[PDB]
Amino acid sequence: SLFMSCCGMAVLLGIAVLLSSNRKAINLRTVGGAFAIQFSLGAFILYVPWGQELLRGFSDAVSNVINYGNDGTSFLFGGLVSGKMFEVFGGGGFIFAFRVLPTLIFFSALISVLYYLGVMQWVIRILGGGLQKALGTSRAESMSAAANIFVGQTEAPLVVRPFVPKMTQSELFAVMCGGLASIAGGVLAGYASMGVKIEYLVAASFMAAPGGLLFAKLMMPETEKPQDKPANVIDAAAGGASAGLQLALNVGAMLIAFIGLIALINGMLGGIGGWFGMPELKLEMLLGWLFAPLAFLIGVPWNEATVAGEFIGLKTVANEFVAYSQFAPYLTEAAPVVLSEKTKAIISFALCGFANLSSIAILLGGLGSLAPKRRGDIARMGVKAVIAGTLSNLMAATIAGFFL
Amino acid sequence: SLFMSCCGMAVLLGIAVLLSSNRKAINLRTVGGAFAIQFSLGAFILYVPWGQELLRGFSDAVSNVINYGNDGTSFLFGGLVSGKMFEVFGGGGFIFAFRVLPTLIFFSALISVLYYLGVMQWVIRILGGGLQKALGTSRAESMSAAANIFVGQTEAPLVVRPFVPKMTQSELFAVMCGGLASIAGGVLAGYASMGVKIEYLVAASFMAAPGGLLFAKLMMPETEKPQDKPANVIDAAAGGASAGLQLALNVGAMLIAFIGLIALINGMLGGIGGWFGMPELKLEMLLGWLFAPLAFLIGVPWNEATVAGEFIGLKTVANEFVAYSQFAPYLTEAAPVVLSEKTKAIISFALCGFANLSSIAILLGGLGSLAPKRRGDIARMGVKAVIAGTLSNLMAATIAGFFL
Amino acid sequence: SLFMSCCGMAVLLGIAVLLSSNRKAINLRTVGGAFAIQFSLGAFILYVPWGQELLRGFSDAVSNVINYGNDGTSFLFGGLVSGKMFEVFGGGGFIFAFRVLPTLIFFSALISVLYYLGVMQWVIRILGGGLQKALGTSRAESMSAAANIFVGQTEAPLVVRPFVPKMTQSELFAVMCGGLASIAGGVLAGYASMGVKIEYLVAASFMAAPGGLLFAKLMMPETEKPQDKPANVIDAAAGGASAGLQLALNVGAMLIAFIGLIALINGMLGGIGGWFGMPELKLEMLLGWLFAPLAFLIGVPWNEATVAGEFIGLKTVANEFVAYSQFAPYLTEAAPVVLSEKTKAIISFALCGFANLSSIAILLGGLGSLAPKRRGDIARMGVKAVIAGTLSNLMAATIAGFFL
Ligand SMILES: CCCCCCCCCCO[C@@H]1O[C@H](CO)[C@@H](O[C@H]2O[C@H](CO)[C@@H](O)[C@H](O)[C@H]2O)[C@H](O)[C@H]1O
Ligand SMILES: CCCCCCCCCCO[C@@H]1O[C@H](CO)[C@@H](O[C@H]2O[C@H](CO)[C@@H](O)[C@H](O)[C@H]2O)[C@H](O)[C@H]1O
Ligand SMILES: CCCCCCCCCCO[C@@H]1O[C@H](CO)[C@@H](O[C@H]2O[C@H](CO)[C@@H](O)[C@H](O)[C@H]2O)[C@H](O)[C@H]1O
Ligand SMILES: NC(=O)c1ncn([C@@H]2O[C@H](CO)[C@@H](O)[C@H]2O)n1
Ligand SMILES: NC(=O)c1ncn([C@@H]2O[C@H](CO)[C@@H](O)[C@H]2O)n1
Ligand SMILES: NC(=O)c1ncn([C@@H]2O[C@H](CO)[C@@H](O)[C@H]2O)n1
Ligand code: NA
Ligand code: NA
Ligand code: NA
């Protein structure tokens, strides 16, 4: 029952200790409180009545913003995003290119506006300051952890960019982990528009900040000594839309290619598998069979561990967007396999992160531009940082499955 | 009657004098003839029979070019831009993304071709030379004023780019105003494809050249002494299409975000307004209530000044494309408020310009690349140049409403 | 009969000799074997039974990859690329923007993956090595010729980029010709998705390598002495998709503008032609009337030479994509003119190449970045290289028409 989840949390923490750069340098106050906060945050908003109300209230607010933003895409694509599409094409009336991708553009503009007004910096300063006074983590890495709750792995460190070039290896590693353990507000609204429960997305986003610091300081403890704009609001929104546009185009092209490549791989795996008596062999079978123990470890029932492994594995070997795209049909009435409500939550939390190998190249470019003489350190800690981000997503999923 | 319009022209001229850098340095020949030309041009093509025929002939030619260009977008999007769309989705069959945006790509290619052939430079040389010999304005600033009739605020100064780095503050300011007082051929065809009368777009475009110089020399008189390519036609069209593509994407992303943001703002203004007994409070109400006196000043009837204020205000606080998008439904039979034919003309002329705050950032980049050591002067005169461009659009609207 | 084709091959070879930089420097072994290989390759896969089976087997494999890739675009655009589109919009249900353009993105990703795995370099090394040992051509120019079978004129020389800055004028010219005589894998799949027979596309692609070297060494014989990466497979696919996206957007914008411009030109040619009693005058008539002798020379029947001239001429004065777009309707049952199966093949082969004037500007940029001090030589040999690429496409078409 609940004993299997507590063992899951132990195993995840155990792997991080085994992969630590210095186990004897691990600060118990830091990693103790970091786990305590992520666990309590999960308890607060998933179990305790008052916390569940604050979570649904924030989620409904996010759901209202998305609909407001949908007026913009409704103007551009007219009846191609109306209800008539379902009357004509049925299930195929939901055009992803026009339904989900424009949301990335709107939310990028909105966040850019909330930065200009000082609203974002105000919230980050409070959350980031609460983390450092309770974990003993440095000023810059704590703000980046808080910033990552709302924005991407490359946009988050911008709040502390003059401190990035001279921050310690442990600090840089935590900044990398904070980004890999989290997503961004734009894609969050995208996944929400695909049927993923907003309550799970917001919850996983907030639990990412302490969870990112947790496995960052476990696998890479501090062994050194740390230290310590658009002309108007309309230009801010315009720049945000432009950034969101570029992101929308890149994500869309990636989904065409990656899903397309998977179909090719399944075609080849059908012929190759046939040589060994398994003509029905596909990529989903391999990933499911290989990630089932991991899925079972974090609280997924034995008879649903294989299916849950397909989604978790796909997120790791590719990215979470491709995973969410294959998992989204399982959140409707036309789902090929009816999953338990707890299993749906676990998959949602475990997927909610940028933790993949391809995000290292993005970290080399974005975070590397902020500190060109540190690109060597970024490339070196890349794989370890992905693992740390992965463990954070898995821990948040285990915690979520526990209180559910 | 016609006395209210003449007072409107006086007020607009009065504001420019009050905001002048040196009222005693204002050349009466310059600003006298500049107003005389813009007024006579309005009289010529809106009142006098022969002029009305030349205007409708040019407009029909423009209307034919758009339809020719529509073969290109018809090929790409097929039945999504056919008549069947109206039979299925009704009013929502008109897909803006495919109906209006591709036109920016085609017209950008066409203008780029007309530049290679020397046709554009031929027309600009004649118009620009007629302005300088009648106003005493310098060679470079006069050609830029003429060029702005057809192309954008960043593309226009390219005809005099080696003279830009060393031109006077008054010259640079006029170049900025010429761009803010006008639009570009590409978006012109876009607005025309949205239902805006081509006769009003072409008229406002041509009246922009003397109107731009008018308020430029009023608010910033000359106090110094002025001075004085693609391999083939197929490469020209290709480069133009590429430029138009980038423009199409940026405009589209902006419309998704801005309209989306407005819907969010109206949602918040509904809740905020409710605290003061006004739950129906929206952005359109604020802009209408605040710009109604201005609209009434330029010839809009008292019972239509509020609605006309919504569109004019929106163009100022954002951009003219967003304004035109909200005004376009009022040009159909399904209009929520039936406006007089004169009011429709006034709104069309007053909107027809790039005069907004966000265009300053664009002027810093485009016009700034032509003279990197002058970006300081551009940022300094930015706001004054927007005001001057705004007054030009308002003057052209007052003149248009007078002869109508 | 077959005597007219052999004369066609003679004429094409004759023109190249007349335009040679040094006829006395022409290596007979080189150009003899180069023609012998291109002719035998045509004989092998178009006439001989075993070769026809290898060609249809490779083509069916390519056809399967396209369908696999179509899962990606099906996900993005849903019912807009389903069969329901034909039930509602009829013929206009086939939306080019969603049916053809996404294929460029998928195939770019795939090729980028096959490069990372070493599969591409393996095939190129074998083909390129077979060409040099039989023609005496240098190492670098032979690999580039082989690489061009699969990728574009700018991507092909990347396999020998450190040898490009110091290769001879004859070597650089051949590298240019190898790209102009061929297309790329991405657009190949596009043309295939437009109804062009894959067997003809693959055949023309492979015959491009010896055909490119043939007319390169004919028009520019060697008179000097020659000499002699993404972190993971997922980053490779992502970079390929990004590149393919940029290509998709540029091609799409070009088709909107160029087709749009043609409609404008036909409108003007109707009015201009009317002055000389020919109001029905169009661009297709001019190109057909002017390229009919050329079409008749390469094996097109007298009563089909005019129509075939329209497509061949359009490919030359613009690009092969615009030509294929106008030729594609003639490959369906709703064709305005029913052409013989041999004529359809000849048009397909003669169009299958990047040989146009606009590709010179692309060669200046892409190939020029690999050797910035050689941009002068590229601009100088530009026109000659286009002619050489044109003659290669025409030769392959003559050979194809001969064995058919
Ligand atoms: C859509 C619905 C909501 C409506 C919102 C409309 C209100 C926006 C007002 C703009 O704010 C000002 O704009 C200036 C221009 O962008 C800025 O000046 C700055 O930039 C100018 C030009 O670059 C300079 O002249 C100034 O000195 C410099 O302070 C200035 O900082 C900024 O406060
Ligand atoms: C679609 C319907 C209408 C059909 C129109 C077709 C006609 C176009 C003809 C192209 O014109 C020439 O093209 C050359 C190549 O672009 C240019 O040469 C220039 O560029 C070459 C290569 O860059 C050099 O070799 C030359 O010396 C240099 O003068 C040259 O200036 C230009 O006049
Ligand atoms: C979608 C279905 C198919 C599933 C396929 C999944 C398998 C992919 C495995 C990735 O391969 C490795 O990834 C590393 C990271 O990209 C590379 O390390 C390189 O890059 C790292 C970070 O940049 C460094 O830490 C390493 O030392 C450096 O060798 C490494 O070369 C590469 O072999
Ligand atoms: N805003 C950002 O920084 C961002 N957004 C998306 N992605 C990348 O795109 C993938 C799919 O969302 C993720 O795994 C990230 O690596 N990065
Ligand atoms: N061609 C150009 O230079 C151009 N086109 C459009 N815009 C900008 O986009 C806004 C909407 O058209 C305008 O106010 C301009 O600031 N600039
Ligand atoms: N991959 C490439 O290098 C490429 N692809 C397309 N084109 C250019 O675009 C035109 C239409 O396909 C061709 O003639 C080329 O000049 N180049
Ligand atoms: Na983040
Ligand atoms: Na202009
Ligand atoms: Na090629």
Question: Both tokens of residue C83?
Answer: 């069969």
CB atoms within 10 A of CB A286: 17
Closest residue on chain C to B249 (Cα): C249
Give the position, in ligand 6's atom list, of the atom nearest the Cα of C155.
Answer: 3
List Cβ<8 Å contacts ≥24 apart for C338-343: C339/C304, C339/C307, C339/C308, C340/C301, C340/C304, C341/C404, C342/C299, C342/C301, C342/C401, C342/C404, C343/C300, C343/C301, C343/C304, C343/C308
Decide: A320 in ligand 4 pocket, CB within 6 A: yes
Say how many CA atoms lie within 13 Å of B234 toward its Cβ: 17
Contact C175, C164 (CB under 8 A): yes
Is residue C372 packed enough to be buried (19+ CB in 10 Å), middle (13-18) or exposed (0-12)?
exposed
Cα B361 from chain centroid (whole Å): 17
What's the one-letter identity of residue B365? G
DSSP B302: G
d(CA B303, CA B296): 9
Name every chain B residue with its beta carbon within 8 A of the beta carbon of C80: 80
- As a whole number of angstroms, the longest Cα–Cα distance in chain B is 66
CB atoms within 10 A of CB A60: 12
d(CA C87, CA B324): 36
Residue C196's contacts (CB-CB under 8 Å, 6 or more residues apart) are: C324, C327, C328, C331, C348
- Of the partner residues A95, A252, A361, the one whose CB lies closest to the CB of residue C80: A95
d(CA B113, CA B238): 9
Closest residue on chain A to B247 (Cα): A242
Q: Solved by what technique?
A: X-ray
Contact C177, C204 (CB under 8 A): no
Name every chain A residue with its beta carbon within 8 A of the beta carbon of B325: 75
Continuous H helices in B26-100:
28-46, 49-77, 84-89, 96-99
Q: Which residue has the tokens 């990112």?
A: A212
Across the interface, whether the CB atoms of C260 and B80 are under 8 A apart is answered: no
Closest CA to A204 of A184, A175, A220, A186: A184
Question: Both tokens of residue A304?
Answer: 């649903």
C193 annotated ligand binder:
no
d(CA C212, CA C218): 10
Cα B185 from chain centroid (whole Å): 10
Q: Which helix (H) or strand (E) holds C371?
A: none
Angle, helices B198-206 vs B341-351, to 10°: value is 50
d(CA C84, CA A181): 42
B320 annotated ligand binder:
yes
Name every chain A residue with its beta carbon within 8 A of the beta carbon of B104: none
d(CA A101, CA C245): 15
Q: What angle do CA B331, B335, B336 make, to 5 degrees?
A: 140
Residue C75 forms contact with A (CB below 8 Å): yes
Question: Both tokens of residue B402?
Answer: 């007078």
What's the one-letter identity of residue C400? A
Contact C107, B90 (CB under 8 A): no
Spell B338-372 as b/e; 16+ CB within 10 A means b.
Answer: ebeebbbbbbbbbbbbbbbbbbbbbbbebbbebbe
d(CA B352, CA B315): 9
Residue A334 forms contact with C (CB below 8 Å): no
* Distances in whole angstroms, Cα of residue C272 to Cα of each of B29, B61, C279, C280: 44, 15, 7, 10
d(CA B104, CA B69): 10
* Distances in whole angstroms, Cα of residue C104 to Cα of each of A98, B259, C185, C241: 20, 32, 8, 8
The domain segmentation of chain A, as residue ranges, is 1-404
Angle, helices A139-147 vs A208-219, to 10°: value is 140
d(CA C198, CA C188): 8
Q: Which of B383, B386, B390 to mutate to test the pocket of ligand 1 (most atoms within 8 A of CB)?
A: B383
Contact C242, A358 (CB under 8 A): no
* Interface test mutation site (partner A, options B247, B261, B320, max chain A beta carbons within 10 A): B261
d(CA C8, CA C40): 17
Residue C184's contacts (CB-CB under 8 Å, 6 or more residues apart) are: C150, C151, C152, C153, C155, C354
What's the one-letter identity of residue B229? K
Spell C235-271 as b/e; 16+ CB within 10 A means b.
Answer: bbbbbbbbbbbebbbebbbbbbbbbbbbbbebeebee
d(CA B25, CA C388): 66
Phi, psi values for residue B86, rounded to 5°: -75, -25
Across the interface, whether the CB atoms of A258 and C72 are under 8 A apart is answered: yes
Residue A102's contacts (CB-CB under 8 Å, 6 or more residues apart) are: A69, A72, A73, A76, A77, A248, B256
Minimal Cα–Cα distance from C369 to chain A, Å?
22
What's the one-letter identity of residue A197? K
Residue B251's contacts (CB-CB under 8 Å, 6 or more residues apart) are: B101, B104, B187, B190, B321
Name every chain B residue with its beta carbon within 8 A of the beta carbon of A86: none
* Interface test mutation site (partner B, options A62, A66, A67, A80, max chain B beta carbons within 10 A): A80
* Interface test mutation site (partner B, options C250, C256, C380, max chain B beta carbons within 10 A): C256
- Of the partner residues C96, C257, C361, the one whose CB lies closest to the CB of residue B235: C361
Closest CA to A66 of A153, A232, A187: A187
Question: Both tokens of residue B84?
Answer: 């069947």
CB atoms within 10 A of CB A142: 27
Resolution of the PDB structure in angstroms? 2.8
Contact B172, B381 (CB under 8 A): yes
Question: Which residue's CA lies nearest to atom 2 of ligand 5?
Answer: B152
What's the one-letter identity of residue A393? N
* Distances in whole angstroms, Cα of residue C140 to Cα of each of C21, C163, C165, C210, C226: 22, 7, 11, 14, 9
Helix/strand/coil for C228 = coil
d(CA B200, CA C395): 56
Say which ligand is closest to the CA of A243: 4
Cα C183 from chain centroid (whole Å): 4
Helix/strand/coil for A381 = helix
Contact A257, C241 (CB under 8 A): yes
d(CA C243, CA B364): 30
Q: Which helix (H) or strand (E) holds B343?
A: helix B341-351
Question: Both tokens of residue C361?
Answer: 């500007």
Closest CA to B390 of B315, B285, B282: B315
d(CA A395, CA A393): 6
Across the interface, whether the CB atoms of C96 and B78 are under 8 A apart is answered: yes
- Of the partner residues A75, A102, A238, the one whose CB lies closest to the CB of residue B358: A238
Is residue B118 packed enough to be buried (19+ CB in 10 Å), middle (13-18) or exposed (0-12)?
exposed
Decide: A229 in ligand 1 pocket, CB within 6 A: no
d(CA A187, CA B166): 48
Question: Both tokens of residue A297?
Answer: 């470890």
Count of residues making up chain C: 404
Residues 211-270 of B with CB under 8 A from C: 230-232, 234-235, 237-238, 240-242, 244-245, 248
CB atoms within 10 A of CB C1: 5
- Of the partner residues C89, C253, C259, the one whose CB lies closest to the CB of residue B75: C259
Continuous H helices in C167-232:
169-180, 185-192, 198-206, 208-219
Question: Which residue's CA lies nearest to atom 2 of ligand 1?
Answer: B317
Question: Both tokens of residue A140?
Answer: 């810059």
Cα A394 from chain centroid (whole Å): 11
d(CA A244, CA A242): 5
Helix/strand/coil for A196 = coil
Helix/strand/coil for A326 = helix
